[PDB]
Amino acid sequence: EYIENWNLQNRRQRTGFTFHKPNIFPYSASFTLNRSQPAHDNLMGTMWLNAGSEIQVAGFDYSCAINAPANIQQFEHIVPLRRVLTTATITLLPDAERFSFPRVINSADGATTWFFNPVILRPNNVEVEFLL
């Protein structure tokens, strides 16, 4: 197979590399806030870990969107890839098993930490968009 893809990228034909569970997502485990208190008695943000060949995202709010309009809080998160893929068969499970247990996490500036005791709901109007 590999010599063949070689001779093909030599012969100017569409190359093809098949793969089982590719480690295409780079490693970066970081979080993002939309609203922050220096003591964390009022927050709104997201966490996400993208490792190996899978990604786990989880958006969280402390107010459960009570003050927000029409009792709805949006969450976005995008991931670009450095190499386009083809004919992918993706699996999608709604949860964050990795973000489901009380954590103590380090702040952005690096002097103190903050708490996390989340309780899981199921997400509504989940939209996944594979754009080219």
Binding site: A70, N71, I72, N125
Partner: protein, 48 residues
């Protein structure tokens, strides 16, 4: 075939009851929905 006097505003007397039936408030709810659709962009699509 009811031919009696005092045949009052049968239409409007009908209307007095009709303007409170469930279909009416539901139609108003439908128009209210269509209105909500035209305002909320600053809040994200809140309707499933």
């Amino acid at each position: 075939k009811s031919t009696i006097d005092a045949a009052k505003s049968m239409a409007t007397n009908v209307m007095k009851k009709f303007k409170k039936s469930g279909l009416a408030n539901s139609v108003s709810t439908l128009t209210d929905s269509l209105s909500d659709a035209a305002s909320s962009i600053s809040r994200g699509s809140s309707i499933r």
